[PDB]
Amino acid sequence: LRLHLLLNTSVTCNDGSPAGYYLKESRGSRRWLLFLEGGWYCFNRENCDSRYDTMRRLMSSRDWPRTRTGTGILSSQPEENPYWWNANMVFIPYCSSDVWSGASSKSEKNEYAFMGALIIQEVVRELLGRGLSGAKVLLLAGSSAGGTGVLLNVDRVAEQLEKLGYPAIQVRGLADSGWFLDNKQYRTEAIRRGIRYWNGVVPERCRRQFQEGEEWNCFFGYKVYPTLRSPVFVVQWLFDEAQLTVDNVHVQEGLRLYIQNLGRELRHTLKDVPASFAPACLSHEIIIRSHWTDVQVKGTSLPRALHCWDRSLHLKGCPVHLVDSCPWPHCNPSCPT
Ligand SMILES: *[C@@H]1O[C@H](CO)[C@@H](O)[C@H](O)[C@H]1NC(C)=O
Numbered sequence: 001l002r003l004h005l006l007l008n009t010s011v012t013c014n015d016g017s018p019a020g021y022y023l024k025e026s027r028g029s030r031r032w033l034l035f036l037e038g039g040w041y042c043f044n045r046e047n048c049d050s051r052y053d054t055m056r057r058l059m060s061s062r063d064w065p066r067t068r069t070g071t072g073i074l075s076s077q078p079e080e081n082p083y084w085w086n087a088n089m090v091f092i093p094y095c096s097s098d099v100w101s102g103a104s105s106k107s108e109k110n111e112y113a114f115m116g117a118l119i120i121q122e123v124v125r126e127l128l129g130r131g132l133s134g135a136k137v138l139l140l141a142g143s144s145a146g147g148t149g150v151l152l153n154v155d156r157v158a159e160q161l162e163k164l165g166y167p168a169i170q171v172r173g174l175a176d177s178g179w180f181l182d183n184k185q186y187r188t189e190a191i192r193r194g195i196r197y198w199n200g201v202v203p204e205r206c207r208r209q210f211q212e213g214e215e216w217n218c219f220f221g222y223k224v225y226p227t228l229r230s231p232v233f234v235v236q237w238l239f240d241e242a243q244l245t246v247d248n249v250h251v252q253e254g255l256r257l258y259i260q261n262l263g264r265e266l267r268h269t270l271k272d273v274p275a276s277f278a279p280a281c282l283s284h285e286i287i288i289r290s291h292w293t294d295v296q297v298k299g300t301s302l303p304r305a306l307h308c309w310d311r312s313l314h315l316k317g318c319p320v321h322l323v324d325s326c327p328w329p330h331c332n333p334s335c336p337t
């Protein structure tokens with residue numbers, strides 16, 4: 001995939017450098033895959049300054065390489081990507097530190113720019129002039145913070161193409177490892193201070209439910225998903241490492257019951273999610289990993305479940321809702337090592 005910096009230089013990373021995207025076209029294909037990178041966030045000046053010292057590529061484009069290798073679902077080789085190997089591939093680097101929700105520019109009162117939501121919109125606009133105008137499906141995918149960003153932006157991308165006069169393009173979402181629980185720790189406020197810092201935006205219907213001061217609720221999958229209109233496939237490890245970090249979990253009866261209860265709660269939030277893939281593993285992210293084809297739930301791989309999803313949106317032995325029921329990490333033999 002080749003780097004293109006955005007022609008509209010007013011849409012910037014944290015430090016004012018232009019945002020961009022990596023692209024690899026496939027001219028015999030009308031399918032487009034836009035992937036959102038992840039990588040936590042920062043919610044005040046002192047904490048964003050620390051990020052700039054040691055995580056600068058997540059805050060600036062000045063040191064980005066000109067190319068990047070497509071891996072996993074972004075791979076063009078059928079052996080590595082049985083799902084969408086012939087699609088047009090786009091990798092959108094995460095340089096706004098706002099879980100892709102911001103719409104605030106750098107100015108005399110703002111040390112950093114938080115324009116995650118505007119970066120996605122500008123990428124879609126400039127892609128239309130490079131072949132996206134002829135697409136029939138646009139899959140907006142992402143991992144970790146990018147997976148949460150899918151949930152916050154998928155309906156706005158569909159509305160953007162509608163108002164631009166492209167009603168035939170079907171917009172869908174693929175959220176990987178971005179389905180978190182606001183549960184009690186083992187031993188929400190950062191998000192809420194972040195939204196004020198970033199001038200963050202959330203989907204309209206969810207915003208109207210929780211109203212001013214409570215938009216932080218829309219960052220949590222099981223609360224925002226029921227308000228979405230576009231089809232969204234949800235991939236989520238039952239024992240996500242980032243979820244265990246924020247829960248201060250690093251085995252006696254107390255912790256055993258805590259971990260078993262966390263998997264039970266996550267499984268409950270997915271009962272009515274018709275397109276989902278939730279293995280009982282302790283891990284983090286999957287869809288751009290090279291070995292993403294190895295894990296299975298009830299005998300069905302993730303690339304197969306995604307293909308079954310495609311067929312359902314036009315089934316015998318081609319399932320789309322796959323959630324483990326065993327209650328301890330790595331009770332599924334296919335978990336990553
Ligand atoms: C550049 O992006 C900004 C922010 O979204 C927008 O207001 C402006 O209209 C854009 N400029 C052009 C020429 O599209």
Ligand SMILES: CC(=O)N1CCC(C#N)CC1
Pocket residue numbers: 038039040041099144145146148180191219242
């Ligand atoms: C692993 C990662 O990138 N995360 C975890 C928390 C989540 C929120 N809110 C998005 C950012």
